[PDB]
Chains A and B, each alone.
With several copies, the nearest count.
Chain A
Amino acid sequence: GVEIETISPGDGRTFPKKGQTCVVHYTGMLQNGKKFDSSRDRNKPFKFRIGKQEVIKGFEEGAAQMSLGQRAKLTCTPDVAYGATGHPGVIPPNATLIFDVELLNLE
């Protein structure tokens, strides 16, 4: 349900394994092109712990398939996203998400 397209490849060798936290500069967007979330706007990296599922399934799996230094784009189906209930007041129900993830560092 998650589709990843490269934007600017990094190393392609060191992949995020379990036991090391992932550090990202995502940039979330709705399907129609309306930006809804960003990390550079807050001007701080988003260190999420991979394995205990602090993020949604689509984002977790997409960040799993990336590599160090790689900048990629995602496409999160509602099945692997917030889904039928959505995120109240932020994301409408049954919405496909797009993320401009850059995996700048590991831990």
Chain B
Amino acid sequence: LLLQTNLINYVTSIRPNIFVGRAEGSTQYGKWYFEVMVDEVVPFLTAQATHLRVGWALTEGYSPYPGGGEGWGGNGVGDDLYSYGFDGLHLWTGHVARPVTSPGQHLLAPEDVVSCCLDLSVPSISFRINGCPVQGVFEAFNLDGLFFPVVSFSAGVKVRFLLGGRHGEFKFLPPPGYAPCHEAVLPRERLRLEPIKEYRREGPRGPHLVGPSRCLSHTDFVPCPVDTVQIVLPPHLERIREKLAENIHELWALTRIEQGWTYGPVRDDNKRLHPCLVNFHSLPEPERNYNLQMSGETLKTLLALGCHVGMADEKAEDNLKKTKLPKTYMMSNGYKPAPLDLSHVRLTPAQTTLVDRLAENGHNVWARDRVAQGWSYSAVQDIPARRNPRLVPYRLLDEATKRSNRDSLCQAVRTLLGYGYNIEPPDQEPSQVENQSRWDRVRIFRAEKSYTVQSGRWYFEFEAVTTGEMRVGWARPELRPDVELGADELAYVFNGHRGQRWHLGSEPFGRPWQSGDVVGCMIDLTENTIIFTLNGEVLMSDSGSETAFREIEIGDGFLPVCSLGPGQVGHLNLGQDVSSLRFFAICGLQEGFEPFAINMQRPVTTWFSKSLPQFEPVPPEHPHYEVARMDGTVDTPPCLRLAHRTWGSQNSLVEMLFLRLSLPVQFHQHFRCTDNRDDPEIILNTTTYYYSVRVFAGQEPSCVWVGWVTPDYHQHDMNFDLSKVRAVTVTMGDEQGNVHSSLKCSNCYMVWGGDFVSPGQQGRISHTDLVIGCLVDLATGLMTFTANGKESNTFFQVEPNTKLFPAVFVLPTHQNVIQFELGKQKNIMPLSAAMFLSERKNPAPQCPPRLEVQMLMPVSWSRMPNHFLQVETRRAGERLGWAVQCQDPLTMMALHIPEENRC
């Protein structure tokens, strides 16, 4: 009942920037291997045991925000279902520890070898301590997203990363088929060690608030070109089928003539004297007509892209000539330019972009073909192992290779342009790579509510390290965390990505900044004005007004605020030290303005919008949703009916909805060994509890899921189905196979309501409401379901000490959607006799006021801790590897809510 307190250590994580994953047609190899060396580990630096875990994490939900979180805080690897870790004695996943047999098992001590083997083809992560096997493997886990190495630690550890090749030694023999993780580095980026998703980093003159980080995706490793098969070849193209081939038959050969690679009559191409500028008739016929139909293939790519040709001016054939240069002179059958010669011809930017994507569609077809012959990517080239450093999609390729591909086809399109045939750009379609996660885009920052100001004149600065979508201004204290600034009336903000002022809409004002600019923000609560000054110069509106906003009502008061888009870095300076301000003396000092934090000892507390979904109660004032509590009559059990308020009207919010009850049910610590009148001697001894939901008519059962969720569910998916449900299997055996334990871990246990309706011809709007029931046995951890009073083949078994919140995910399609019925079955107790200790012997259903429906709010406010851990990330040497060092201890006082298992 009462909220518990404790002192806990701050726990952080560190990763190499190595990202691997599995996808259909992915250019990445499905097995990888990395090692961790333990230098020094202080046993008990503070009152709590020192934390250290090593494992793999998933890029789309492993978000280790410092401070509070799941369970008793200090979350790291294995504390959720997006990570899997090992500590020397336990296999961590979903904030549960499971013991593992090991050859001389113990916690991670100094001079220990941790080798984590990852296989993605079959789901499996294997651990090896000191080169010796560890009898436990994670299995049957979801593959969406990218898997990366990670070590989570508390203060007072020194751990080294061994990545093989020049980035380690591995000190042992990796198992066959597992490549060193250092071979997965993308060609555009180098290897370095950086923390997981963050919101602050140290800077020269102060901490930098860091917006969301752009994350690479597995879908970005599949090369998806435009198909160049179903294209009938046009007459105007077959008319020019020859010259565009003749000009690309030795164009790659032209560069190296009169050098060490100068041709000779005895040999031919690929013999270190390649050119053979004579003609392609001397060259072999198959590659010859292959080059012709490759020129045709490039024209077919032009067609599929949307390029068409038209002839206007003088024929270039007349006004073109071949130049027998002093260079490229050869003795074999006369001398000529190796491709077909061309005079002065130019190219417009439309042609530049078009040849860029033309080279893209050449590269992605080549990469697709290589993958279809089995090849994959590796930063070091291995021909007998069939791996290449250039098997990545063009967007991920390096600039050197980009330019090298673009040069040849740029010459080709130039030769096409010379003949006067138009290169027609296609239509323009604006597209967004990622659309679903609109919330993982911004990250609002603001001062704590106690610093609310209602009088005087205040000033603060905001250096713009980057030049992207960042907004800075002032906000009222009740500012919502999930709504962009200015889009509502709760904030007055200036967007200097393109020079706009936002308050209930956008209108142009001032000018956009560049790097290094210090957007100083005034405020005048007496004159009711807000003034934005850039580099000491007042930003001026497109009229006579010099103040961005005027006649602003005092109200509750105002707080300095700023938000940052993806890949943005901004320095916020409230001015705790007055001399640190760079433009206060220039502007503001003589006007009577003051810094916002002129006389304060401690740094101003900052609250940011955490992008972690949490269950929160349904507001009574909510516009679209309402929850009605129905009294339990003599023949009807008490209910929690959900009804859509604005359904069927204009501006109705119809989207994915996640619900749960406010109180959980906990299974027994120890599992057991090995009419309609209830039996009095069974109803008192039963350990089975039932609840049902009545999905009203007009709500499609294809969009309804019913069951239970554990208190660590944090998935906000707009396209939810049973596929997205996180799961993992923990497999345990002895030293030589003999698997004697295979358990299931998941944060979601629900059935899909679309599978309990008979597939009728039409009329999915059933006149009879579907009554999905759920049953639990607290003595066994077994879960069952009843579709309409008949059992279903689905069944779930869970470990003890488990907490399950009754949950329903639904997409509304009617005025009345669902109705939580808190009834009972024959010889089976209701839920109300399970959630309350004092009600354990009462068969009569109840709906006490603590029991209520809660939604899943995607974004919630949070607090930035005043001090962060000090981690050193550096490369110790070529053999030692990368060394991570954290020594100074930090402790925070955690308030843990018992029934929600979060602190």
Contact = CB atoms under 8 A, between A and B. Distances in A.
Interface of A: 5-9, 25, 27, 31-35, 38, 40-41, 43, 71, 96, 100, 102
Contact of B107 (A8, A27, A31): A8
A8 B669 contact: no
B109 interface: yes
Contact of A31 (B47, B71, B669): B669
Interface in B531-587: none
Interface string B44-84: 10111100000000000000000000011000000000000
A8 to B, nearest CB: 5
A96 B44 contact: no
A8 B109 contact: yes
Contacts of B669: 31-32, 96
B6 interface: yes
Contacts of B105: 6
B508 interface: no
Contacts of A32: 669, 801
B98 to A, nearest CB: 13
Contacts of B109: 8
Consensus secondary structure, chain B interface: loop
Consensus secondary structure, chain A interface: loop
Contacts of B72: 33, 35
Contacts of A33: 71-72, 801
Contacts of B4: 34
B505 interface: no
B89 interface: yes
Counting contact residues on chain B (CB < 8 A from A), the size range is 10 to 19
A41 B47 contact: yes
B99 interface: yes
Contact of B106 (A7, A31, A40, A41): A7
Given A34-B4, A38-B47, A102-B43, 6 more contacts: A8-B106, A27-B49, A31-B669, A35-B6, A40-B44, A40-B46
B107 A7 contact: yes
Contacts of B99: 5
26 contacts: A5-B99, A6-B106, A7-B89, A7-B107, A8-B43, A8-B106, A8-B107, A25-B44, A31-B801, A32-B669, A32-B801, A33-B71, A33-B72, A33-B801, A34-B4, A35-B72, A38-B47, A40-B46, A40-B47, A40-B48, A41-B7, A43-B47, A71-B107, A100-B49, A102-B43, A102-B44
B840 to A, nearest CB: 15
Contacts of B43: 8, 71, 102
B732 to A, nearest CB: 15
Nearest to A25: B44
Contacts of A96: 669
- Residue of A8, A25, A96 contacting most chain B CB atoms (<10 Å): A8
Contacts of B7: 41
B897 to A, nearest CB: 13
Contacts of A40: 44, 46-48
Per CB-CB distance, the 6 closest pairs between chain A and chain B, nearest first, are A40-B47, A41-B47, A8-B106, A8-B107, A31-B669, A7-B107
Interface in B11-55: 43-44, 46-49
Contacts of B44: 25, 40, 102
Contacts of B71: 33
Nearest to B71: A33
- Residue of B46, B89, B109 contacting most chain A CB atoms (<10 Å): B89
A9 to B, nearest CB: 6
Nearest to A32: B801
Contacts of A35: 6, 72
Contacts of A9: 106
Nearest to A95: B669
Nearest to B104: A9
Contacts of B107: 7-8, 71
Interface in B644-658: none
Nearest to B46: A40
Nearest to A42: B47
A27 to B, nearest CB: 8
Contacts of A100: 49
Contacts of B106: 6-9
A29 to B, nearest CB: 11
Nearest to B669: A31
Contacts of A25: 44
B1 to A, nearest CB: 13
Nearest to A96: B669
Nearest to A5: B99
Nearest to A7: B107
Contacts of B6: 35
Contacts of A7: 89, 106-107
Interface string B881-899: 0000000000000000000
A50 to B, nearest CB: 23
Contacts of A41: 7, 47
A46 to B, nearest CB: 14
Contacts of B46: 40
Interface string B79-109: 0000000000100000000010000011101
Contacts of B89: 7
- Residue of B4, B49, B109 contacting most chain A CB atoms (<10 Å): B49
A76 to B, nearest CB: 14
Contacts of A31: 669, 801
A107 to B, nearest CB: 21
B889 to A, nearest CB: 13
Contacts of A43: 47
Interface in B340-391: none
Nearest to B48: A40
B78 to A, nearest CB: 15
Nearest to A31: B669
A95 to B, nearest CB: 9
Nearest to B901: A33
Contacts of B801: 31-33
Contacts of A6: 105-106
A68 to B, nearest CB: 15
Nearest to A9: B106
Interface in B105-122: 105-107, 109
A25 to B, nearest CB: 8
Contacts of A5: 99
A75 to B, nearest CB: 12
B838 to A, nearest CB: 15
Contacts of B47: 38, 40-41, 43
B99 to A, nearest CB: 7
Contacts of A27: 49
- Residue of B47, B72, B107, B669 contacting most chain A CB atoms (<10 Å): B47
Interface in B745-801: 801
Interface string B788-816: 00000000000001000000000000000
Nearest to A41: B47
Interface in B661-709: 669
Nearest to B106: A8
Contacts of A34: 4
Nearest to B896: A34
Interface in B124-155: none
